[PDB]
Design a protein around this ligand. Structure first.
Ligand SMILES: O=c1[nH]cnc2c([C@@H]3N[C@H](CO)[C@@H](O)[C@H]3O)c[nH]c12
Ligand SMILES: O=c1[nH]cnc2c([C@@H]3N[C@H](CO)[C@@H](O)[C@H]3O)c[nH]c12
Ligand SMILES: [Ca+2]
Ligand SMILES: [Ca+2]
Ligand SMILES: [Ca+2]
Ligand SMILES: [Ca+2]
Lengths: 301, 304, 300, 303
């Protein structure tokens, strides 16, 4: 499976990228970077940290846009750390090295990849700002992409509070949801993250040592575990888990047509509607396989 | 003055491009196209028709985006004609020739120009689509642009396409909001629909859009004919007034205000430009030198 | 208890102010305003909004300085919406009315109050600028104040990032900490708030309706809950909770001497050192009494 | 010219204040006091002496802040004497009389003067604590001030109290940085410590600081006697040069470089003025008309 990754690489993005790196069936052809919550300069550095912590370093990193399309970024008190990646120490990992960054804008490089790579998939882990612009510049190119895997949205389960990716750039989410075919789109929603939430203190796979990747997992997740009683709502790792393992990862899903509310009190929320040609919105995951996948990426290779 | 022009080349767009074509102190470095008055393909041919009629086809034309940012499209063939240029006949002008269209997308073309052309200015005569996309991709690039001259909005709150919204900013309000909160409004000069109505002309007391004797006079007469009838004999030279201000600078303005502009992005007033006084906002032209304006429109039509 | 409140009234300021209005043992004798979460002008409006929704507008409101002492802007400008109070609609709350401002500067007013009010306590929910200036012009007046309750600093294992008040003006914080007696100071730290936070998907006390105050709390906190994964980090409300309810609110604290790092890579941080003549740094709170106090002020 | 003076009146302040008093086109509308060369309490006493010696005590005097904003009062090897004015005897000058001191704090009186007096200029001869605090409280008010004249700093990197940094800006660096980054540096002239050592006379080649015949010459002679003895008999008239520029305009200035100044509020070298070229920065006087300087220094001592 060929896969492009779009990320605002915070803590859970890095574990999601690591899930893809840990499966030999996955060839990551490029990683695009978008700002917003975490600054774009910080995202590019954190993608570099993740790839350097892993073995393979032959993946081009592209910087995209610096802000949502139109909505304000809404300043963020990053309690987990200012660098957007748990405030880890580069000297503890051997990643105090120059960051790699391609010259091409992420929008154009994504378009070229879409034009020149057959059976290209994309895993989107961030606000869809980069994707919406590429669909605007060249809808013919992005429509060649085989399938879309997106972390975003909150459908009715009650609809939990706190969905981030689409609320951060609702116009971009609408551009994606109105242009790329929803039938070819698979959603790992914030409702799914909240539904498969667990306490990391009941496990040990976020608190291991013995290799660099294990230390990375433990140190990046450390502040999230501390400040929230151990509770974890896995969003991006679940989206990578679904993109990488397919129906093996899915227990139940619902076909739903999705739209963004761009006006009024419900601005930035989503409308969902049963529709066999709509998004595949995953409802239940193989959680036993998910935590097994989380441990395996930290095994000695 | 090096100038970039972004147009949905309708009838008044083309007359604005002739104003810039007619002044030798103006260098048009490239023309970006966007849907609006008509569809993007019609705009591209309309610009080609305009350049061919004038006779200086050495200006690159770039195809922009195919739709607004988020809004559905808003073609008005009952105003600018089915082809966006008054449904003229190409045999009346000798423009039955292939159209020039460069390979590079207008957004990437404009970003490049802002990066390699010094003291670049832009004249924006159409919905804020190509420009907003380019400010999102490369703000550091587009902020290199010396000044922004934009036809759009209405500080009165009196629109055309809606009671509250001017067409270009109502056709893509998010794009209009993107420009107004990203490019420095202090380096931005606005020729609104307010200005277009205030400095409007009665086409049966003024005949400068009704001459023959040369190709330019025929082009201007035939293109403006359907829109003059649609307006009731009235001419609201919105785009030509914006080019007038960009080309002729201070001596084109009679009264202007410094106003911070912001878009109404929802509700029945979608597309409305709110205005409030601010010495760091946009120079919103209130009165143009109508006398010098008609003068330069006649001079580009003279046989000499 | 007579209480002065120094605030940059963002969203959690307004709820902290409501905790003081809801307790009959508390007499708010004056509210000073400083920039921070919002501009000084926006802070004055938001205090006016909070007092009007409650209904006890008989409180003087003074405007302070317009910037931190030495630092340039704010490390986190425009944090609680464009208006500083979650961009609420005045027409929904009936607060589109003339706002009250007093005309003496907030510094001179705090100096006057500390010189004329016996047993005056002060609650500081914002960057230490108004206080540092008044301490620099009349320390004789400010030291008469009975006790200081300050939201700020992050002490500690693990230290949560993002502390605003002392990072926004580290000189003002150091002025206060080395001039007003720390033994008469009680701290609700950013560490305490982070470790005493709630998620809207587990607790509903900021998602109620049925009267004006419940609507004010829900709408103000709404964009915080929406853009922070549901996380409610109630820093200023915890400070007010400690100031108003005292020993009932505190489960554990430590006597620590606090100073500011004013140079180097660690600019804006807080050095803590065990010291029985230092500030009372609250470490644990009665979370159950706190959630009930939040709900109590929202009763019909 | 309407002029407000902020002083830590040591010896060279008093001569500078006398420079302003001597010119009839200058209107001193108020003198604010701050700790520096000596205690605030001595500064208030030392301005009173200076006005009594001249003979015009109709100028209001305001006590300012008791300490720097952030820094400690720090070691003052009392070079201006124990009392701050060369340890002179009031019985020798007829100044054994009550002092005058206004009720208002200097910060509030400065704010009020800025809001109610047209075309007010300020002359700063001391650590800038009062001005920064008034800038903190009312930028609206202090920006109505036409021009700032400030003795302080050293754009050459050669201070006095520290090898880097001049006394007035080393004594309160945060306040000096507040003034620079809030009051427009283009409306600011600087008599630097570069300037005080540059235009520095040896006292044994002039007699303008060793005269009698009237009370003003005795005051000047007795107050400068200690400061002259410290140096190699040299005269680095820091304060008086600043007053000379503020009063006598362009003819006071010979060569002047527009430079943007900023403060090092950190590190082993603490309290120095970072100098860089800036057309919109301070007007740092580099050379003063020394001949005209000595003549007005003599004339103020006339009968
Ligand atoms: O009556 C009109 N209604 C809508 N659009 C236009 C235009 C076009 N829209 C813009 C004016 O709003 C201008 O660029 C012009 O090309 C002219 N007249 C009208
Ligand atoms: O040797 C000195 N060391 C420290 N301060 C001064 C001063 C005082 N400090 C300022 C010059 O540094 C000036 O205003 C003056 O009043 C003169 N000479 C010295
Ligand atoms: Ca993410
Ligand atoms: Ca047009
Ligand atoms: Ca606050
Ligand atoms: Ca002095």
């Amino acid at each position: 499976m060929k896969l492009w990754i779009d990320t605002d690489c915070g803590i859970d993005d890095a574990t999601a990228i690591l899930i893809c790196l840990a499966n030999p069936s996955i060839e990551i052809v490029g990683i695009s970077c978008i700002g917003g919550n975490a600054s774009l300069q910080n995202v590019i550095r954190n993608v570099n940290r993740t790839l350097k912590v892993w073995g393979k370093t032959d993946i081009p990193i592209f910087g995209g846009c610096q802000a949502p399309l139109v909505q304000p970024k809404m300043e963020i008190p990053h309690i987990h750390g200012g660098d957007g990646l748990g405030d880890i120490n580069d000297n503890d990992f051997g990643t105090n090295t120059p960051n790699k960054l391609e010259k091409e804008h992420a929008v154009n490089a994504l378009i070229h990849a879409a034009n020149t790579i057959e059976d290209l998939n994309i895993l989107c882990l961030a606000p869809l700002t980069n994707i919406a612009i590429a669909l605007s510049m060249a809808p013919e190119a992005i429509l060649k992409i085989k399938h879309f895997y997106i972390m975003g949205g909150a459908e009715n389960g009650i609809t939990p509070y706190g969905e981030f990716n689409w609320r951060a750039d609702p116009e971009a989410a609408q551009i994606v949801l109105q242009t790329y075919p929803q039938y070819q789109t698979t959603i790992a929603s914030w409702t799914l993250a909240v539904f498969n939430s667990f306490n990391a203190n009941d496990y040990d796979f976020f608190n291991l040592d013995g290799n660099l990747v294990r230390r990375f997992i433990r140190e990046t997740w450390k502040p999230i575990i501390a400040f929230d009683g151990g509770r974890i709502c896995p969003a991006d790792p679940l989206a990578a888990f679904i993109a990488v393992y397919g129906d093996r990862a899915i227990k139940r899903a619902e076909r739903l047509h999705l739209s963004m509310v761009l006006e009024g009190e419900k601005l930035g929320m989503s409308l969902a509607e049963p529709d066999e040609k709509g998004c595949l919105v995953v409802k239940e995951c193989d959680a036993e396989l998910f935590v097994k996948i989380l441990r395996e990426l930290q095994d000695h290779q």
